[PDB]
Coordinates of C-alpha atoms in Angstrom, one line a residue:
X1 CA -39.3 -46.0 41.9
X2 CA -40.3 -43.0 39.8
X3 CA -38.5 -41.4 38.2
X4 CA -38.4 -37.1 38.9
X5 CA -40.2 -35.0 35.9
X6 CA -38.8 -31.8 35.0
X7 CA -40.5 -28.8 34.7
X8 CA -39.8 -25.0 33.8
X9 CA -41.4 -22.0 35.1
X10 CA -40.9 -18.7 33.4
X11 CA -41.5 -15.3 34.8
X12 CA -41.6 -12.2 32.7
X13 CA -37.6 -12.1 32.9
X14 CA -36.5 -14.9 34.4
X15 CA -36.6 -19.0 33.3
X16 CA -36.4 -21.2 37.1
X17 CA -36.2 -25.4 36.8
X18 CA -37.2 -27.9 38.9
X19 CA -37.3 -32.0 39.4
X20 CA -40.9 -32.3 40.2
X21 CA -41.6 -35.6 42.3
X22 CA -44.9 -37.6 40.5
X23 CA -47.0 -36.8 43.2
X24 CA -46.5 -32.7 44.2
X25 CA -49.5 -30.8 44.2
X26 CA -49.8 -27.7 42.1
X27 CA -49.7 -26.2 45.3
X28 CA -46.0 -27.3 46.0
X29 CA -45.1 -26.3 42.9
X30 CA -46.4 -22.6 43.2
X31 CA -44.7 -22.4 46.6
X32 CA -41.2 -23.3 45.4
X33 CA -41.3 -20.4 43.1
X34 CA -42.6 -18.5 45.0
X35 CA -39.8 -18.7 47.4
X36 CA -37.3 -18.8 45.0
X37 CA -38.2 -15.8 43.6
X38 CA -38.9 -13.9 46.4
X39 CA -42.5 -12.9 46.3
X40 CA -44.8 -12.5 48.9
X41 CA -48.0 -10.7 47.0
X42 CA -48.7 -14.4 45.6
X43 CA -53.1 -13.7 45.7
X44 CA -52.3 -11.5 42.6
X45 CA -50.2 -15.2 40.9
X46 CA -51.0 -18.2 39.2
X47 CA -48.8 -20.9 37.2
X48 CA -50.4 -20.7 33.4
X49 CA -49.8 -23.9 31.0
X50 CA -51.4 -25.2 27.9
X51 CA -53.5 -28.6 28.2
X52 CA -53.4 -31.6 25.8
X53 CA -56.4 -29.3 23.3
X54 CA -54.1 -26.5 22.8
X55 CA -56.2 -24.0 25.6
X56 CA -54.4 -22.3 28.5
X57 CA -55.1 -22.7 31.8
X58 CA -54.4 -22.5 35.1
X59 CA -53.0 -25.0 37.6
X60 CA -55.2 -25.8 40.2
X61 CA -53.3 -25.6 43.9
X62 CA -55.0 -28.7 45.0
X63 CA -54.2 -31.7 43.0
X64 CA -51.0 -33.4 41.4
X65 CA -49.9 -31.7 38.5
X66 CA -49.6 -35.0 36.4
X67 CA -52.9 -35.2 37.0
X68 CA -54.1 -32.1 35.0
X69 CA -53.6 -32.5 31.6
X70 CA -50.8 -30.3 31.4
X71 CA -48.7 -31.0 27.3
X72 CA -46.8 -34.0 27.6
X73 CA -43.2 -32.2 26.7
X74 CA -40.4 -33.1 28.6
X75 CA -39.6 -30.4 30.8
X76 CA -43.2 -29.3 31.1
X77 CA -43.6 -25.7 29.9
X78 CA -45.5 -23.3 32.6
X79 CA -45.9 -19.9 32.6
X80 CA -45.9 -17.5 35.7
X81 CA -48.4 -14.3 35.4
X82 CA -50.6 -12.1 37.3
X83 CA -53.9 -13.3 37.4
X84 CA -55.7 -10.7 38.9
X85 CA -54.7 -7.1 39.2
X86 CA -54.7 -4.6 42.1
X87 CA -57.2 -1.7 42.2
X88 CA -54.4 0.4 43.2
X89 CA -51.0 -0.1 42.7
X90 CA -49.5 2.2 44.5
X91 CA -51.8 0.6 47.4
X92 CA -50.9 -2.8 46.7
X93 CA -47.8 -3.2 45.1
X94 CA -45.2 -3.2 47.8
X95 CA -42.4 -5.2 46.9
X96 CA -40.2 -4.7 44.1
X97 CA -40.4 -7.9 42.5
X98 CA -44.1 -7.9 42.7
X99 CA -44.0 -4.1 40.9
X100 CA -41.2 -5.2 38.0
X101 CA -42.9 -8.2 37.6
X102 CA -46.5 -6.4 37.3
X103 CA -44.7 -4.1 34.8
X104 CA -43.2 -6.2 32.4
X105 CA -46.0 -8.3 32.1
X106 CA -48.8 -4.8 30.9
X107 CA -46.0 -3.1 28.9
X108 CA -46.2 -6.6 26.7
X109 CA -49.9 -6.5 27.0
X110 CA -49.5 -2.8 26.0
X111 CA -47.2 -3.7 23.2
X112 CA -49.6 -6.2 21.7
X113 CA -52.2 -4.1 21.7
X114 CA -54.1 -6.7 23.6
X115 CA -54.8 -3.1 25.7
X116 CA -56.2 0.0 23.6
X117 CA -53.8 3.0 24.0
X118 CA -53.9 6.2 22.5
X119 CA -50.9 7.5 20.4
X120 CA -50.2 9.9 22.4
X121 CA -50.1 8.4 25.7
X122 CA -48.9 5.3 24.3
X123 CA -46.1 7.4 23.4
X124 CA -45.7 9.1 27.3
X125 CA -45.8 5.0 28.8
X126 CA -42.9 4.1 26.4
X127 CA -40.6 7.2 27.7
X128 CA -41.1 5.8 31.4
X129 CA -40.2 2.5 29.6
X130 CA -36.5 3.7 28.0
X131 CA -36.2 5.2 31.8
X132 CA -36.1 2.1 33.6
X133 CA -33.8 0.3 30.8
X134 CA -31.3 3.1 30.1
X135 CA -31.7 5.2 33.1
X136 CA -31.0 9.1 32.7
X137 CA -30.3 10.3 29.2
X138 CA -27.0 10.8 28.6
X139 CA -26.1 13.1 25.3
X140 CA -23.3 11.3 25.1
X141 CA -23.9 7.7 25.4
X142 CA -27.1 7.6 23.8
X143 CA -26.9 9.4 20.3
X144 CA -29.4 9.8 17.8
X145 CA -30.7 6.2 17.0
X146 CA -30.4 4.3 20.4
X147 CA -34.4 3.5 20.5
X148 CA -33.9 2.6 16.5
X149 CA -34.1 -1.3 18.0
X150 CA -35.9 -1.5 20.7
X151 CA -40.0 -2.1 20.6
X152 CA -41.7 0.7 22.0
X153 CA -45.0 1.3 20.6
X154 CA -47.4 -1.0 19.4
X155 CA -47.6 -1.4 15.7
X156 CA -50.9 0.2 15.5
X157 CA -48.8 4.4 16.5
X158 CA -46.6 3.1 13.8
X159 CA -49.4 2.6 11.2
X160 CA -49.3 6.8 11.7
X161 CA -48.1 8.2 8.4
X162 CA -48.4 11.3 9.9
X163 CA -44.7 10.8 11.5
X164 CA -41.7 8.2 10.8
X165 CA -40.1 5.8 12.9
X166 CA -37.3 8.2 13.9
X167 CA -39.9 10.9 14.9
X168 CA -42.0 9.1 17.0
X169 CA -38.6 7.9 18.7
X170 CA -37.5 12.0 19.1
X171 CA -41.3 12.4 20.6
X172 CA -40.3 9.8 22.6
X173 CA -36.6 11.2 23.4
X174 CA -38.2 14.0 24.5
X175 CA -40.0 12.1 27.5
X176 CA -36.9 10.9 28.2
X177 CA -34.9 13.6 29.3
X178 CA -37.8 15.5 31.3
X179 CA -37.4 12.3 33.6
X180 CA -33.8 13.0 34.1
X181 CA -33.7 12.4 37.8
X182 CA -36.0 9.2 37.8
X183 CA -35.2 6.1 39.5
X184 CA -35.6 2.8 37.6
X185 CA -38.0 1.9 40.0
X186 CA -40.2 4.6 40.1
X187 CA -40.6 5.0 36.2
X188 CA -42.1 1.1 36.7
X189 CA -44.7 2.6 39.5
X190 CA -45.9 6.1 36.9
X191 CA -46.1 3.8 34.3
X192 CA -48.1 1.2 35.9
X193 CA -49.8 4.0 37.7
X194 CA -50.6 6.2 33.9
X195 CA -51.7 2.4 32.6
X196 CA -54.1 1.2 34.8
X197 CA -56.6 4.4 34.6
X198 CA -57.4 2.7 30.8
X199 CA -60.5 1.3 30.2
X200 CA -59.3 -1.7 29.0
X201 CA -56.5 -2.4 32.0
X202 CA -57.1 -5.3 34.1
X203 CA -60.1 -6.7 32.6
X204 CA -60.6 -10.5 31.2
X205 CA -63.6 -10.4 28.1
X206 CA -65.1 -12.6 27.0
X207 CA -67.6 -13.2 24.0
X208 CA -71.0 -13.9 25.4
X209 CA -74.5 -13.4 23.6
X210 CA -77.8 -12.4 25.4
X211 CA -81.5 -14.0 25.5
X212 CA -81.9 -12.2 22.0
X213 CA -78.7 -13.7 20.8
X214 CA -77.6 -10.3 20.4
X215 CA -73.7 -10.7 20.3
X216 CA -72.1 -8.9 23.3
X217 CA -68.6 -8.9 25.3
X218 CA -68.5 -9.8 28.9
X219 CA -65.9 -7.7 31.1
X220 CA -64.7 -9.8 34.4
X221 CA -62.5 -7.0 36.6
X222 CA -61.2 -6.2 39.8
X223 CA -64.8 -3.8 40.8
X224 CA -67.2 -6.1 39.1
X225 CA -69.0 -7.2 35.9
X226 CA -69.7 -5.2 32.9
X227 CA -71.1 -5.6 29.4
X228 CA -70.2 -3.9 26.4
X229 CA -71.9 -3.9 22.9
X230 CA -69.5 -5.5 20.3
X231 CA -68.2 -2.9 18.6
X232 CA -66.8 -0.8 22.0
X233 CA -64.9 -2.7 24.4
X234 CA -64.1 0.7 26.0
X235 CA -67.3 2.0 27.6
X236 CA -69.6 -0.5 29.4
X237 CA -73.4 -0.3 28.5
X238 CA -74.4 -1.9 31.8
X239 CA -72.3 -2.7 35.0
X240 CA -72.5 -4.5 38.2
X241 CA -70.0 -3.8 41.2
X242 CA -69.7 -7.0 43.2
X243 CA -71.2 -5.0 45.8
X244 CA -74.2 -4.9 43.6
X245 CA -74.2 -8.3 43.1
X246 CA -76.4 -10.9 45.2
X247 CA -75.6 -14.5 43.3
X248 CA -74.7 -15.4 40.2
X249 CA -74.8 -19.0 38.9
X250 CA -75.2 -20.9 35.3
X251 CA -76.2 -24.2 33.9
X252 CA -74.0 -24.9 31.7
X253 CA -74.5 -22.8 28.8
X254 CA -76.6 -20.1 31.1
X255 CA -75.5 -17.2 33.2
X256 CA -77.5 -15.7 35.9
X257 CA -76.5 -12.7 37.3
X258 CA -79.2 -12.3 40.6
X259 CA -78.5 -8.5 41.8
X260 CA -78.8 -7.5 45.3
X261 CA -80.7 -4.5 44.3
X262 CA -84.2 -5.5 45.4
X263 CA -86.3 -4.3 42.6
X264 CA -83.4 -5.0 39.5
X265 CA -84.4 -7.7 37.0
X266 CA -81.9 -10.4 36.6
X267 CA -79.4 -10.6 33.9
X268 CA -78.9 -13.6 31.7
X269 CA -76.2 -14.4 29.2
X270 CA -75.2 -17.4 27.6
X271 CA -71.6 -17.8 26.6
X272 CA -70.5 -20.2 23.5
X273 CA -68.4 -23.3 24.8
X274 CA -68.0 -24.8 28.7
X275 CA -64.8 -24.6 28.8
X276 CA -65.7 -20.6 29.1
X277 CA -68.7 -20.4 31.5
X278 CA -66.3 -22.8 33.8
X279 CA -63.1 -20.1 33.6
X280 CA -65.8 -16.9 33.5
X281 CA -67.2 -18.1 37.1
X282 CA -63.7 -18.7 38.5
X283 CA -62.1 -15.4 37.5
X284 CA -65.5 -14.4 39.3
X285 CA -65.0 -15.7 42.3
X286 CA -61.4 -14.8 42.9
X287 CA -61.7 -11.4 42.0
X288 CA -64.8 -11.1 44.5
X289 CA -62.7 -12.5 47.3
X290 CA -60.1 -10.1 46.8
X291 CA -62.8 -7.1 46.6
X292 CA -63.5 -8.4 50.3
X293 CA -60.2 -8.6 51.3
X294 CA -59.9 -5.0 50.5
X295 CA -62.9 -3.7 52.3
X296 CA -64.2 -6.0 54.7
X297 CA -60.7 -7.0 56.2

């Protein structure tokens, strides 16, 4: 009789462990912690892991989990992240798990400045940060030099010789008291809702390169497809709503994007590796089933 494998699961701030039987599916698997935590937004979820090669990945909810390459550690390592993200989230963040959760997860995103954000407002999302961890500011508990530890800005506001450390945490202090009535869970919800208005919020790129073999980045969002020249991943140079989209298919190193507009010619892209055009058509396809879900439901 086999014996049980261990596994942990980590959320953005919590670890769960489980004795995984040899033969649950990653679909059990996402189920227990999704009851255990208490979610029940689980389209927006996915259980992340790193395969034998280093890459990550996602589990697929169909098949055993020893049967997907997952590290060979013991207590297998797995993440728990959003995979796709709302178009609203006020609309569709409901729960309070599901908005702390969606919170922690961009303010690190934020933080690593895997997310372009201006100084300024960089500055405005950290005060809505100190405001859900400290609460109102206090002039008596939190003297002078209470932020001095925390991580608040990316590195790249702190590259600003324009200011010091201690000034950008007073600019900061500031924001803080103007949101002296705020409850810790509303301060999650503006900054959420002051974060996802940037351009590069929400969306997965990818380096792709064109029938010139021009080199160009591939945007895969919540609205659609867009693609940006290499040196802006800010503006897109050409989009295409799902809406606007008829089919789109690739063998294996070629993307074909077939739009529904009548008289549009079709767009082709080829993207480096397989192991990309496989993860670029599935982050297609579950975005433009949640599109749906949104409109035609």
């Amino acid at each position: 009789m086999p014996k049980p494998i261990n596994v942990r699961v980590t959320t953005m701030d919590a670890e769960l462990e489980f004795a995984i039987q040899p033969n649950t599916t990653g679909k059990q698997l996402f189920d227990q912690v999704v009851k255990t935590v208490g979610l029940r937004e689980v389209w927006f979820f996915g259980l992340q892991y790193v395969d034998s090669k280093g890459y990550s990945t996602w589990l697929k909810l169909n098949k055993k989990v020893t049967q997907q390459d997952v590290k060979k550690e013991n207590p297998l390592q797995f993440k728990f992240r959003a995979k796709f993200f709302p178009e609203d989230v006020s609309e569709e963040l409901i729960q309070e798990i599901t908005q702390r959760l969606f919170f922690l997860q961009v303010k690190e995103a934020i933080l690593n400045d895997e997310i372009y954000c201006p100084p300024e407002t960089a500055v405005l999302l950290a005060s809505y940060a100190v405001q859900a961890k400290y609460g109102d500011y206090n002039k008596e508990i939190h003297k002078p030099g209470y932020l001095a530890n925390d991580r608040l800005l990316p590195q790249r506001v702190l590259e600003q010789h324009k200011l010091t450390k201690e000034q950008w945490e007073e600019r900061i202090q500031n924001w803080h008291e103007e949101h002296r009535g705020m409850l810790r869970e509303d301060s999650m919800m503006e900054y959420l809702k002051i974060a996802q208005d940037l351009e590069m919020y929400g969306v997965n790129y990818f380096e792709i390169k064109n029938k010139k073999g021009t080199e160009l980045w591939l945007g895969v969002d919540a609205l659609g497809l867009n693609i940006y020249e290499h040196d802006d991943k800010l503006t897109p140079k050409i989009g295409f709503p799902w809406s606007e989209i008829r089919n789109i298919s690739f063998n294996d190193k070629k993307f074909v994007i077939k739009p529904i507009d009548k008289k549009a010619p079709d767009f082709v892209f080829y993207a480096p590796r397989l192991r990309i055009n496989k993860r670029i058509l599935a982050l297609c396809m579950g975005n433009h089933e949640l599109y749906m879900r949104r409109r035609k439901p």
